Design a protein around this nucleic acid. Structure first.
Lengths: 21, 49, 513, 252, 28, 267
RNA sequence: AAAAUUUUAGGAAUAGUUAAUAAUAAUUUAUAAUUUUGAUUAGAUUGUUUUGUUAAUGCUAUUAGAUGGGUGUGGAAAAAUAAAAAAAA
């Protein structure tokens, strides 16, 4: 359940890549 | 020539398992251990003089 | 032809002259100084020198204007001889760090070292063509030349130290408010191509900081000019000295903003950043020791093994510091503070504005003491009739009747410090100037010397000009000095003139000479 | 407005026993763009690491030839001479069992000195030869390099080609042909032309006799006629001459 | 060496030096 | 992997702990694997890795991580330059049994890396301490290779910058000079050391014999960083801090049939 | 120059490396060598005539001394305070 904290969302958006066309 | 000094007894026997006296022989000059020991522990903060 | 130089105030250590008391000639003079001090104010100079405590007990009401007016010059005293010491002076560090205690002890150390040299080597001060010193070095040099007896010299340095402490007490900010830092533009990389332009730019920086912070109680100003291009010591409040440190930082000069614009907006952005940091809660004294040794024996949470054993800091006992201890190199929560030593902004242990506008009242109160302390004009003219004495003011030889010297001394007296800012609230008087005019009226050289020995308490010392006058016009090729720690020899050797000069320390390097 | 370094979060946790743990963790620095600090000395400058020799086989061994041929003026005579002498020294310092575990990689970090050093040296020699041969030995159309130094460089190159690594490991990522001796026919022809251009090339001295023997060996190995090492006037009037006949006729 | 250094590495939304917070800027 | 260990703040804290209390291999491997799989490495992570790399005094790992930082396009601070120059200075070197400890230093050319690191640290606007310069000079002069001209230039720079001289670099430079047969430079170094007051060379002062002329396996020693024998140093001073020349040995701190605590006494 | 006996509660890799050649090879040739029949590092302990206990196949002890070279003296390095060794009448 630790994975449902907003810190996990911050980590996810940090790990999000850049999709360039 | 100040050679009148008697032979030092700085090495001291310490008792060990079967009361065999262990003697701390002084380190020979030709090693890097004393050279490393004489330097300051923290070069940044300890005085170099 | 060699020169004699006395040390500055900073080079004070515990146990300086202890090893030099074996000579009976030194011992007799030391006993005379001890007896004079006990008769006058009853403080233990020998105790202070031998060990440096955090608190000392001194005679009752010793620190007061009543004492400074009653004692005058070599008071007979003996009224307070066995009276108990019911008042104390304390210090978080050693009690020797107090100015009113280090000045008499340091002058006594100078005198005993001079006697030791004169006895062991047959040393002759008259051999040196020019003799000079710092703020207290001048009093020591006068005593060495024989104008002032050692007892009166000790009394005078104690008096001026007490007056400096009085000025600090009168200042609303506590002792922690005053801070002293030496600035190095050459390493700070302020147009390294032209060091003279670097120095001028640093002066412009301190002027702009003072002008911008004139609206508040903060103030900074230069105190002494030691090195031509590598050292300039200033004092001031932490709020403005942090801005000065921000200005004297290539990383802040470039990364923060500008890096190509004028230097006037640098002061504004530095003070804005300093205000932001002080709002953010950055400590004002980050350079206060890395950490002490940690030893515990609770064993409730550390365990039995870790008890009574020093906690090793790092895999090699901190031989290579980690990121936490390198804040000065990589800007961190404490490194980003302006008051962090970075090899050009060097803090000094002294926390007193030695030469600043705060001590003009101290000069006014101190002038009569020197006036009564100076000896007879017959002896003074015996000294000055045609080793020349070099003055901190104007950085030139002390010629009593030199037409240019009178103008230069008046210019120095009327010349405000570079960082000094004055207004209606600030307290200043023309008493020193009128006393110097009374002396210039050629009534006596006693008044002139007593005004020139009291005008340097607040006025900055031009040590760079002192060195230039000693070397160029006086033709001094060897410039050795008598100091406990040999700090002024570095100042002599670092400057580039090319001519070559060799520096030695009489007590420390007696074997070399 | 000015860039501010991100702060480090200070967290104090009091243990149940009573041991306080203080942490300074840059959670903000873990995210967000990395703040770039422009250097005081104009643009940001960083150290290059294109000269250090490492155990990786994805690149070639960094030699002084690499930094000499990084885009300089190839027409400079002293630059050509320095490149030639560095290549000569490289060849001079230049002049192995199948291990299963090293098949899908290079030789281990500890055994770099015993297994990979020679392979790297040979690969570097071949890769530098493929770029230097047309500079040390100019094509036949005064010269930038003298005949003696060209001959010495060719002899060192031949020694390297003959002492090239013969055992081909399965870990060798390059083509197997790179482990074979070089073909220096054009280089030998150029050396012969430069030697016949100037007279008195061969002398009855011991060193010159050794040079003549080396030239004969080069011609025999690389299928280059030995007549090109002598003026055509000495060979004119004959339909064809062989290397052995040339040696037996011009042997001092 | 560049292939090994870029092995299993991809550009991030915020790791780019020219990135800004927030990523999309119109016009405890 | 569970989210608790997937959180990059846990990655940073465990990497820092690993650097504080492990060897260089642990930190290097963990950081490389983390960079390979997720775990965006920042300047803080790189500095923490360089801390352990400099502590163990290794050059190949330092150049590898510097290349990795260049690839990742991370702008470093002065701590990175300090760490890399200190690692170069602490790189191991020793002539034991006619066999050098490190044969890779000649190929690595750590002296040039140290010099360029010092130059970049000075140029970019970061503070330059005495330790970085002393480490650079140590890299320049060692029993391995002879680089005395550049060391002399660096020493002149230190002299005009009024920087402190370390006894280790003084000894290395003196040995390099006497090995390259430059007694004039050796005498100049001795005069400088005697004037400064270095512990090793406080007493050693000699007169100038070149007064009328102007300017123009071998060594058998082993040098390793402090961390290799820090445990030996600590236990030696804990046991006998009143007899420094005692040669701390077995049975002085552990009885028979019991471990002595330190694995690998005297290497 | 050999051969045999060789310790650890929870056990995995080791290395200027094997053989042939030679008064070779920092750069020869080869499908190399060590190890789960327990190797290599690490910890412990000065190795195969010594005790203690018992009726006894057992169990439990023992000592002092061989810790790299680097003008290599000497027959032999064991060569940097340490006797119960009479050493050219």
């Amino acid at each position: 359940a630790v994975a449902n904290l907003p810190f996990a969302k911050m980590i996810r958006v940090g790990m999000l890549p850049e999709l360039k066309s | 020539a100040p050679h009148v000094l008697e032979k030092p007894k700085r090495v001291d026997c310490l008792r060990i398992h079967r009361n065999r006296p262990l003697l701390l022989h002084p380190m020979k000059d030709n090693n890097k251990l004393l050279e490393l020991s004489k330097l300051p522990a923290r070069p940044e903060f300890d005085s170099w003089t | 032809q060699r020169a004699l130089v006395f040390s500055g105030q900073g080079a004070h250590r515990r146990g300086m002259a202890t090893e030099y008391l074996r000579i009976p000639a030194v011992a007799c003079l030391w006993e005379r100084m001890k007896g004079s001090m006990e008769q006058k104010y009853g403080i233990s100079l020998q105790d202070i020198i031998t060990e440096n405590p955090t608190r000392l007990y001194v005679y009752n009401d010793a620190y007061d204007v009543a004492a400074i007016c009653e004692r005058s010059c070599q008071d007979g005293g003996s009224v307070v001889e066995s009276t108990p010491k019911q008042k104390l002076i304390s210090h978080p560090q050693g009690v020797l760090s107090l100015t009113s205690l280090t000045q008499p002890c340091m002058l006594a150390a100078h005198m005993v070292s001079l006697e030791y040299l004169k006895e062991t080597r047959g040393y002759s001060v008259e051999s040196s063509e020019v003799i000079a010193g710092h703020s207290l070095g001048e009093f020591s040099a006068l005593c060495a030349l024989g104008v002032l007896s050692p007892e009166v010299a000790i009394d005078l340095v104690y008096r001026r130290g007490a007056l400096m402490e009085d000025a600090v007490k009168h200042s609303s900010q506590s002792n922690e408010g005053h801070l002293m830092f030496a600035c190095n533009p050459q390493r700070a990389k302020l147009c390294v191509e032209d060091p003279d332009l670097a120095v001028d730019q640093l002066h412009i920086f301190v002027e702009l900081i003072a002008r911008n912070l004139s609206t508040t109680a903060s103030f900074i100003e230069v105190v002494n000019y030691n090195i031509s291009y590598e050292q300039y010591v200033v004092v001031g409040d932490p709020i403005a000295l942090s801005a000065l440190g921000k200005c004297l930082d290539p990383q802040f000069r470039a990364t923060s903003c500008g890096s190509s614009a004028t230097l006037d907006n640098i002061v504004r952005t530095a003070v804005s950043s300093v205000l932001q940091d002080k709002q953010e809660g950055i400590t004002m004294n980050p350079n206060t020791g890395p950490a002490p040794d940690f030893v515990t024996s609770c064993a409730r949470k550390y365990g039995i093994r870790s008890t009574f054993r020093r906690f090793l800091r790092g895999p090699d006992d901190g031989y290579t510091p980690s990121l936490e201890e390198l804040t000065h190199l990589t800007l961190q929560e404490d490194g980003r503070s302006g008051l962090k030593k970075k090899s050009w902004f060097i803090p000094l242990p002294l926390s007193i504005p030695f030469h600043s506008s705060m001590l003009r009242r101290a000069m006014d109160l101190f002038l009569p003491v020197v006036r009564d302390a100076l000896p007879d004009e017959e002896t003074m003219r015996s000294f000055f009739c045609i080793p020349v004495w070099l003055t901190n003011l104007t950085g030139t030889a002390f010629r009593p009747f030199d037409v240019d010297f009178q103008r230069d001394a008046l210019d120095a007296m009327q010349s405000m410090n570079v960082g000094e800012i004055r207004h209606n609230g600030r307290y200043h008087t023309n008493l020193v100037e009128l006393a110097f005019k009374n002396g210039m009226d050629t009534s006596s050289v006693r008044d002139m010397c007593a005004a020139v020995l009291a005008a340097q308490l607040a006025h900055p010392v031009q040590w760079i000009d002192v060195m230039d006058s000693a070397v160029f016009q006086h033709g001094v090729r060897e410039a050795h000095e008598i100091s406990p720690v040999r700090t002024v020899a570095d100042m002599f050797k670092r400057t580039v003139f090319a001519l070559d000069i060799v520096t030695r320390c009489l007590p420390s390097e007696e074997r070399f000479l | 407005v000015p860039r501010r370094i991100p702060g480090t979060t200070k967290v104090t946790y009091t243990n149940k026993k009573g041991r306080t743990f203080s942490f300074s963790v840059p959670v903000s620095e873990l995210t967000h763009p990395q703040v770039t600090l422009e250097s005081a000395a104009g643009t940001w400058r960083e150290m290059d690491t294109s000269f250090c020799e490492l155990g990786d086989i994805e690149d070639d061994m960094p030699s002084p030839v690499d930094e000499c041929l990084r885009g300089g003026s190839s027409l400079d005579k002293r630059l050509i001479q320095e490149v030639r002498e560095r290549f000569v020294s490289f060849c001079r310092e230049y002049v192995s069992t199948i291990l299963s575990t090293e098949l899908n990689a290079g030789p281990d970090y500890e055994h770099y000195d015993r297994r990979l050093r020679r392979k790297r040296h040979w690969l570097a020699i071949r890769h530098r030869f493929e770029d230097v041969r047309y500079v040390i030995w100019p094509d036949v159309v005064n010269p930038s390099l003298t005949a003696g130094e060209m001959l010495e460089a060719l002899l060192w190159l031949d020694a390297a080609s003959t002492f090239c690594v013969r055992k081909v490991h399965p870990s060798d990522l390059g083509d197997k042909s790179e482990f074979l001796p070089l073909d220096l026919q054009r280089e030998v022809e150029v050396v012969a032309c430069h030697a016949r251009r100037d007279l008195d090339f061969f002398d009855p001295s011991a060193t010159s006799l050794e040079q003549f023997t080396a030239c004969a060996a080069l011609c025999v190995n690389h299928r280059v006629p030995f007549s090109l090492f002598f003026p055509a006037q000495d060979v004119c009037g004959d339909a064809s001459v062989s290397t052995g006949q040339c040696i037996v006729a011009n042997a001092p | 060496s560049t292939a090994r250094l870029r092995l299993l590495t991809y550009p991030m939304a915020l790791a780019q030096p020219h990135a800004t917070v927030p990523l999309i800027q119109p016009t405890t | 992997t569970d989210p608790v260990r997937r959180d990059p703040t846990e990655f940073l804290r465990v990497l820092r702990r690993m650097s504080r209390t492990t060897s260089w291999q642990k930190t290097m491997l963990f950081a490389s694997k983390g960079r390979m799989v997720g775990y965006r490495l920042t300047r803080e992570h790189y500095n923490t890795v360089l801390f352990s790399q400099s502590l163990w005094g290794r050059a190949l790992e330092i150049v590898r991580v510097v290349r990795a930082m260049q690839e990742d396009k991370v702008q470093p601070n002065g701590a990175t330059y300090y760490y890399i120059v200190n690692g170069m200075g602490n790189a191991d070197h020793g002539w034991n049994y006619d066999f050098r400890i490190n044969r890779r230093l000649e190929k690595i050319q750590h002296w040039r890396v140290a010099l360029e690191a010092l130059e970049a640290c000075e140029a970019n606007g970061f503070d330059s301490t005495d330790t970085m310069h002393n480490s650079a000079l140590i890299t320049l002069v060692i029993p391995g290779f002879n680089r005395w001209q550049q060391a002399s230039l660096l020493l002149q720079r230190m002299l005009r910058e009024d920087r402190r001289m370390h006894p280790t670099m003084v000894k290395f430079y003196h040995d390099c000079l006497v090995r390259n047969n430059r007694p004039r430079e050796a005498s100049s170094l001795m005069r400088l050391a005697a004037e400064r007051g270095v512990h090793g060379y406080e007493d050693k002062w000699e007169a100038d014999v070149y007064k009328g002329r102007p300017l123009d396996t071998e060594i058998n020693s082993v040098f390793r960083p402090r961390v290799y024998r820090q445990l030996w140093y600590k236990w030696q001073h804990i046991a006998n801090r009143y007899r420094p020349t005692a040669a701390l040995k077995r049975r002085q701190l552990a009885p028979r049939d019991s471990p002595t605590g330190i694995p690998g006494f005297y290497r």
